[PDB]
Structure 1
C-alpha cells in the first residue's frame, strides 16, 4: 500500500524465489500451451 514495509533479506529473497518460481511456471505453462497450439496447427493440415 502507501507505507513501505521493511522486508528482511531472507524474506526478500524468499519473495524473489517465489516470484521467479511463478514466472518459470507460467513460462512452462505457455510453452505447453504452445505445444498444444502447435499440435492443433499440425493436425489441421494432416
Structure 2
C-alpha cells in the first residue's frame, strides 16, 4: 500500500524465489500451451 514495509533479506529473497518460481511456471505453462497450439496447427493440415 502507501507505507513501505521493511522486508528482511531472507524474506526478500524468499519473495524473489517465489516470484521467479511463478514466472518459470507460467513460462512452462505458455510453452506447453504452445505445444498444444502447435499440435492443433499440425493436425489441421495432416
Deviating 4+ runs (over 2 angstroms) = none
| Residue 40 of structure 1: aligned partner | 40
Structure 1's unaligned 5+ residue stretches are: none
Q: CA deviation at 1:43?
A: 0.0
TM-score calculated relative to the size of structure 1: 1.00
Post-superposition CA distance 1:25-45 (Å, at most 9, x none): 000000000000000000000
TM-score calculated relative to the size of structure 2: 1.00
Instruction: Work out the CA distance in 2 between the residues paired with 1:28 and 1:45.
Output: 26
CA RMSD of aligned residues (A): 0.0
| Residue 27 of structure 2: aligned partner | 27
| Alignment: residue pair count | 46
